[PDB]
Design an enzyme around this catalytic site. Structure first.
Site: not given
Ligand SMILES: *[C@@H]1O[C@H](CO)[C@@H](O[C@@H]2O[C@H](CO)[C@@H](O[C@@H]3O[C@H](CO[C@H]4O[C@H](CO)[C@@H](O)[C@H](O)[C@@H]4O)[C@@H](O)[C@H](O[C@H]4O[C@H](CO)[C@@H](O)[C@H](O)[C@@H]4O)[C@@H]3O)[C@H](O)[C@H]2NC(C)=O)[C@H](O)[C@H]1NC(C)=O
Ligand SMILES: *[C@@H]1O[C@H](CO)[C@@H](O[C@@H]2O[C@H](CO)[C@@H](O[C@@H]3O[C@H](CO)[C@@H](O)[C@H](O)[C@@H]3O)[C@H](O)[C@H]2NC(C)=O)[C@H](O)[C@H]1NC(C)=O
Ligand SMILES: *[C@@H]1O[C@H](CO)[C@@H](O[C@@H]2O[C@H](CO)[C@@H](O)[C@H](O)[C@H]2NC(C)=O)[C@H](O)[C@H]1NC(C)=O
Ligand SMILES: *[C@@H]1O[C@H](CO)[C@@H](O[C@@H]2O[C@H](CO)[C@@H](O)[C@H](O)[C@H]2NC(C)=O)[C@H](O)[C@H]1NC(C)=O
Ligand SMILES: *[C@@H]1O[C@H](CO)[C@@H](O)[C@H](O)[C@H]1NC(C)=O
Ligand SMILES: *[C@@H]1O[C@H](CO)[C@@H](O)[C@H](O)[C@H]1NC(C)=O
Ligand SMILES: *[C@@H]1O[C@H](CO)[C@@H](O)[C@H](O)[C@H]1NC(C)=O
Ligand SMILES: *[C@@H]1O[C@H](CO)[C@@H](O)[C@H](O)[C@H]1NC(C)=O
Lengths: 194, 596
Positions: B151, B255, B327, B356-357, B384, B463, B487
């Site tokens: 961080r 996440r 990936h 999934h693909e 998605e 938070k 992101h």
């Protein structure tokens, strides 16, 4: 059996012509055998409209016209009487009472380049629809606005748009070679069959 | 003649030019991605520059037709998309500064590394070792040190850059007709000009809040449960009624809660559903996996793959000097070209990833007939969800038994279902509060309600408020914690996941109802039914021509998001959680702090 009609020149000619400037051939005064067509690779479409394919050797005519060009894979369905579409009413129109056969086979191996084959063009714009068996070669700046063009620019486009062929394209966009045969009667000796 | 025809002709020309240019760009990108060389980088850069320039001049030319003389409602969307996605309004100096800022941020994030104390010879990187340490290491001090070090080392540098970036982005957005850049993102869901389906930008926020108000109970129950389990792991540190420390969530930012499955398994005695050994015994490989996925997709009536897909796609790691990114991605190069890139192992995870693909590939193949500017999903969440539902339906014991990987003697009962539901919940339910908080904070900071000197303060307050997570070490304004995320630093919207998490369950319930399945929702298979496939294909073929509200109504008979399918899916776990949490307090108090 003396003279054989040339079908090894329409087919098997290395390079064909652009669809907007399609090529025409006249076949007459020879014995025409239609069994040589089946000696090639399997056809994507083999449709005969006016006559049965098997009975081609029982009736005969006076003149036979062969038209050949190259188009996309999904535009083959537009080469038929009573069809509407871009290539149908701007480059090659068939009459509703057409009598003949339409041949189309895949030619990906011979008409594809890794960089791109930019040697095939088709007409994208026109002021009016095409009469049957009519061609248009003049290349003038098409006008879509009220202001006169006086040169290529806004609202004024070059009528012809070019293809681009790569071997990695999927089926339906890869090149297809099309041959259209025509038969007709007129008050004259036939002299073309056997 | 008239404005509409003058626009139609221009669109017709643009449609044919853009396809060729985009195909060239995509082919260059694929050739670089499968094969890393300098010349490939040069070709990719050249193709991208050509595509960008062409889009620029086309967007400049598109301004000639005013938008108030068109009522066809399909040409208007294409013109609006061109103007939106090709226009530039800032000065050249400001554009250069923004590009430099973005490149600096990306390079700083990509090359960021931390060096071991009293050992400068070795410096740890993020992807190779930091993620593994966060996932596996059980040392409190080591995890805290890694978290704080990362961080500090990636937040302190990027704070002034982020300030300048947000200033420039707000200036650019205000240059346009949007209120601010957050409005610019929220405009993706805007729908106008259709009666009974209008959607404004301001509505979305309300909807999101409403959905959260309907999901707060379940999540908090789960939270309490996890806390108790973590209290069994680290006894001294965790307060009985306090918020969880941030560095013990199984990853860098919290996440996902997937990595906590081993410690918090409900019933460890029961065997787990694993098919790796069965696949090894049956001697499987990548081709067999992809063939099985294709067969499953055929079983619902959808068309299957083409010859070019098999001939061109790569499904195994080339190895040797050939280096490529592993990936998994689905490529749509255009002109009837579809490929999949993935380095495949013989594991259940790859077995699900293939499905999934292939879902994404099928959705891409569905709308090929639409115009160039409309070949896309209804919004940023539909694609998605469409990809995710296929993997949702392909991991059931019934499907495995039908395939043959699972033994017929296997049986299901209380504990198997409970374990499966908890495993799914640790992945799906946990990420929603994090995503919602991040998007809310970013919207607030774009709005300007939070002055810079309070930024981190407010962030940490949230938070403690929403997610119920307390920082281990206090931070002043020098740090930039949010910028550490991939992101955030790379300028990507973060609301698509929230909408996907609901759309997928709505679609799954609708499809299962169409198949007349009976029983619990979480055990549902649509392999052999054709009505569900027909309805899905009818939705998929639309593309971007119709507003997303109309497509959602056509599928599920609703005009907006709803959280009821998700609660219906997770009810069996919810009842067990409520039964178990009888002797445990539910809720957290923000006053407690680990550092006294
Ligand atoms: C108008 O202009 C905008 C740009 O402003 C264009 O928007 C792009 O749209 C595409 C497609 O919607 C976006 O592509 C998506 O990018 C995501 C970001 O991933 C990044 O990180 C991963 C590593 O985690 C990298 O590998 C990747 O390269 C990115 O750097 C991806 O995650 C998405 O992948 C999803 O779909 C694939 C299948 O396609 C699945 O396999 C994945 O699992 C995943 O579900 C996706 O690829 C792109 O990000 C957008 N750009 C920006 C800047 O946001 C529009 O396309 C354009 N409109 C036009 C041209 O008509
Ligand atoms: C808005 O503009 C679009 C674009 O023109 C209109 O779509 C057009 O709709 C007509 C009639 O449905 C289509 O004509 C069809 O052509 C095929 C041949 O391709 C023919 O076989 C059919 O019988 C029919 O005549 C036309 O192709 C189609 N245009 C495109 C580009 O797909 C739409 O109708 C307009 N909507 C309104 C409300 O004005
Ligand atoms: C991976 O990329 C390299 C270079 O980017 C390719 O090597 C080139 O191959 C072409 C044709 O095979 C030659 O004309 C070039 O001279 C080669 N360049 C160099 C520097 O050697 C390589 O072929 C690619 N890999 C594959 C499998 O195609
Ligand atoms: C969908 O159809 C396939 C094809 O019949 C079914 O596959 C059968 O599955 C049973 C086990 O339930 C096997 O005993 C058969 O040998 C399979 N047949 C074939 C041809 O593979 C499949 O079960 C069906 N889906 C469902 C959910 O029942
Ligand atoms: C045409 O035919 C000749 C001989 O029949 C052959 O050598 C040549 O390869 C053929 N070319 C094509 C394009 O079919
Ligand atoms: C058209 O046909 C004639 C007659 O065979 C031939 O000489 C000419 O080269 C052909 N042109 C094209 C473009 O195919
Ligand atoms: C699936 O692919 C096979 C080729 O192995 C093909 O024969 C079949 O027709 C395809 N399925 C459908 C529904 O067309
Ligand atoms: C376990 O299954 C039995 C089935 O008879 C049921 O009565 C019981 O309530 C279940 N308990 C749990 C904790 O799921």
């Amino acid at each position: 059996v003396t003279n054989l009609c040339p079908f090894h020149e329409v087919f098997n000619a290395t390079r064909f012509a652009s669809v907007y400037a399609w090529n025409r051939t006249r076949i007459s005064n020879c014995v025409a055998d239609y069994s040589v067509l089946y000696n090639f690779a399997p056809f994507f479409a083999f449709k005969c409209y006016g006559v049965s394919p098997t009975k081609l050797n029982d009736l005969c005519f006076t003149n036979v016209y062969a038209d050949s060009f190259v188009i996309k894979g999904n535009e083959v369905s537009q080469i038929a009487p009573g069809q509407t579409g871009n290539i149908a009413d701007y480059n090659y129109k068939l009459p509703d009472d057409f009598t003949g056969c339409v041949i189309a086979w895949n030619s990906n191996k011979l008409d594809s380049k890794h960089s791109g084959n930019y040697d095939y063009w088709y007409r994208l714009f026109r002021k009016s629809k095409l009469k049957p068996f009519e061609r248009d070669i003049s290349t003038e700046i098409y006008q879509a606005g009220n202001k006169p063009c006086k040169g290529k620019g806004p609202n004024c486009y070059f009528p012809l748009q070019s293809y681009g062929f790569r071997p990695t394209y999927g089926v339906g966009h890869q090149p297809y070679r099309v041959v259209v045969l025509s038969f007709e009667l007129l008050h004259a000796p036939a002299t073309v069959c056997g | 003649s008239t404005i509409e025809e003058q626009a139609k002709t221009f669109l017709d020309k643009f449609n044919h030019e853009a396809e060729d240019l985009f195909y060239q760009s995509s082919l260059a990108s694929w050739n670089y991605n499968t094969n890393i060389t300098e010349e490939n980088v040069q070709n990719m850069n050249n193709a991208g520059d050509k595509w960008s320039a062409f889009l620029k001049e086309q967007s400049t030319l598109a301004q000639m037709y005013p938008l108030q003389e068109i009522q066809n409602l399909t040409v208007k969307l294409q013109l609006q998309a061109l103007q939106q996605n090709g226009s530039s309004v800032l000065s050249e100096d400001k554009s250069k500064r923004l590009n430099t800022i973005l490149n600096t941020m990306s390079t700083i994030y990509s090359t960021g590394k931390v060096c071991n104390p009293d050992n400068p010879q070795e410096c740890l990187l993020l992807e190779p070792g930091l993620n593994e340490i966060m996932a596996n290491s059980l040392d409190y001090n080591e995890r805290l040190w890694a978290w704080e070090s990362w961080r500090s080392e990636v937040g302190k540098q990027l704070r002034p850059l982020y300030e300048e970036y947000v200033v420039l982005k707000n200036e650019m957005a205000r240059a346009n007709h949007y209120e601010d850049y957050g409005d610019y993102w929220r405009g993706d869901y805007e729908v106008n000009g259709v009666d009974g389906y209008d959607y404004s930008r301001g509505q979305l926020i309300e909807d999101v809040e409403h959905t959260f108000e309907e999901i707060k109970p379940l999540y908090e129950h789960l939270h309490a449960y996890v806390r108790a389990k973590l209290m069994n792991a680290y006894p001294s540190y965790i307060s009985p009624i306090g918020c969880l420390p941030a560095h013990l969530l199984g990853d860098m930012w919290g996440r996902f809660w997937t990595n906590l499955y081993s410690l918090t398994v409900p019933f460890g005695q029961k065997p787990n559903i694993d098919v790796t050994d069965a696949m090894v015994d049956q001697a499987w490989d990548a081709q067999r996996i992809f063939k099985e996925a294709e067969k499953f997709f055929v079983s619902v009536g959808l068309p299957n793959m083409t010859q070019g897909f098999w001939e061109n796609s790569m499904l195994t790691d080339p190895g040797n000097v050939q280096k490529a990114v592993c990936h998994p991605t689905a490529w749509d190069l255009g002109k009837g070209d579809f490929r999949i890139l993935m380095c495949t192992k013989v594991t259940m995870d790859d077995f699900l990833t293939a499905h999934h693909e292939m879902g994404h590939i099928q959705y891409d193949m569905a709308y090929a007939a639409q115009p160039f500017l409309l070949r896309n999903g209804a919004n940023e969440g539909f694609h998605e969800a469409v990809g995710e539902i296929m993997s949702l339906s392909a991991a059931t014991p019934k499907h495995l038994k039908s395939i043959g990987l699972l033994s017929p003697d296997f049986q299901e009962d209380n504990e198997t279902e409970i374990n499966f539901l908890l495993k799914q919940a640790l992945t799906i339910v946990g990420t929603l509060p994090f995503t919602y908080m991040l998007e809310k904070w970013r919207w607030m900071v774009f709005k300007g309600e939070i002055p810079k000197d309070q930024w981190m303060k407010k962030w940490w307050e949230m938070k403690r408020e929403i997610v119920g997570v307390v920082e281990p070490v206090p931070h002043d304004e020098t740090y930039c914690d949010p910028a550490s995320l991939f992101h955030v630093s790379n300028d990507y919207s973060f609301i698509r996941y929230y909408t996907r998490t609901l759309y997928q369950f709505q679609f799954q319930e609708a499809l299962c109802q169409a198949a007349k399945h009976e029983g619990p929702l979480h055990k549902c298979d649509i392999s052999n039914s054709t009505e569900a496939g027909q309805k899905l294909f009818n939705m998929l073929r639309l593309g971007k021509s119709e507003p997303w509200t109309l497509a959602l109504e056509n599928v599920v008979g609703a005009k907006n998001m709803n959280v009821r399918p998700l609660l219906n899916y997770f009810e069996p776990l919810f009842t067990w959680l409520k039964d178990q949490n009888k002797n445990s307090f539910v809720g957290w108090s923000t006053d407690w702090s680990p550092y006294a």
